[PDB]
């Protein structure tokens, strides 16, 4: 039976998809696309601000009902939980000089220097697919020395999460002169496949109710006027 009151967990450091107002209020994408499938559902959700570490362990303990923070789907997790459709895609992209002929292949990067951050997704896709054949590849302990390095003409390319480097990089005035190069790297092995409301795997009826929900205020074309108000390209993908 569905929940009376859903709770949805969600860390509130991630403009722009959770974070919270000078009122308190939580505000982002997350939170419209949640605040709306719980309008289409007909049912009462409650925002309960958590650490992203414990709100798969919250949501198991039932202490959540469902997890909207920008989680991927990622086999690891689908293993633990279930997924609604997925709500918006988390790829990463090349970022590089404005006017840069620099395409995601390996045929393009050979010769280049990618500067990737250490321990992230973006190294683990790189060194798999692109440092065992020659690119050079090197990784940063820090993302600032990455964007100095890129500035510098130290490195001729970065690869790094897409919405991270438009909200933070190329949005700033150090970001001016730069540009993604090429289309973003998709691959459900390093980056899951786009990000989705977790929920517990036995709770099949709240996530047939997600998934109508979602569903219907994709067609109506609530989708794209709510993403309109932070993005200016396609955070859906495909």
Same mark, same amino acid.
């Given at each position: 039976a569905l929940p009376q009151t859903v709770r949805i967990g969600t860390?509130?450091?991630?403009? !722009?998809f959770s974070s919270k107002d000078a009122k308190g209020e939580f505000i982002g994408f997350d939170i419209d696309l949640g605040n709306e499938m719980c309008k289409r559902m007909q049912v009462k959700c409650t925002w309960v601000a958590s650490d992203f570490d414990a709100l798969i362990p919250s949501l198991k303990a039932k202490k959540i009902d469902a997890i909207i923070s920008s989680l991927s789907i990622t086999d690891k997790r689908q293993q633990e939980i279930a997924f609604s459709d997925k709500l918006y895609a988390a790829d990463s992209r090349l970022i590089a000089?404005?006017?840069?002929?620099?395409? !995601?292949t390996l045929e393009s990067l050979k010769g280049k220097h990618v500067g990737v951050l250490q321990g992230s997704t973006q190294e683990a896709y790189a060194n798999d697919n692109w440092r065992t054949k020659g690119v050079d590849v090197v990784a940063y302990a820090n993302q600032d020395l990455i964007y100095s390095d890129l500035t510098a003409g130290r490195l001729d390319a970065a690869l790094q999460d897409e919405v991270a480097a438009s909200e933070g990089?190329?949005?700033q005035p150090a970001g001016k002169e730069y540009a993604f190069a090429g289309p973003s790297v998709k691959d459900k092995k390093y980056f899951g496949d786009g990000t989705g409301v977790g929920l517990r795997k036995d709770d099949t009826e709240l996530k047939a109710a997600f998934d109508k929900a979602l569903t219907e205020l994709r067609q109506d074309g609530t989708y794209d006027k709510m993403a309109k108000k932070y993005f200016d390209f396609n955070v859906y993908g495909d």
């Open positions: 860390d509130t450091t991630y403009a !722009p000089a404005k006017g840069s002929p620099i395409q !995601p990089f190329l949005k």
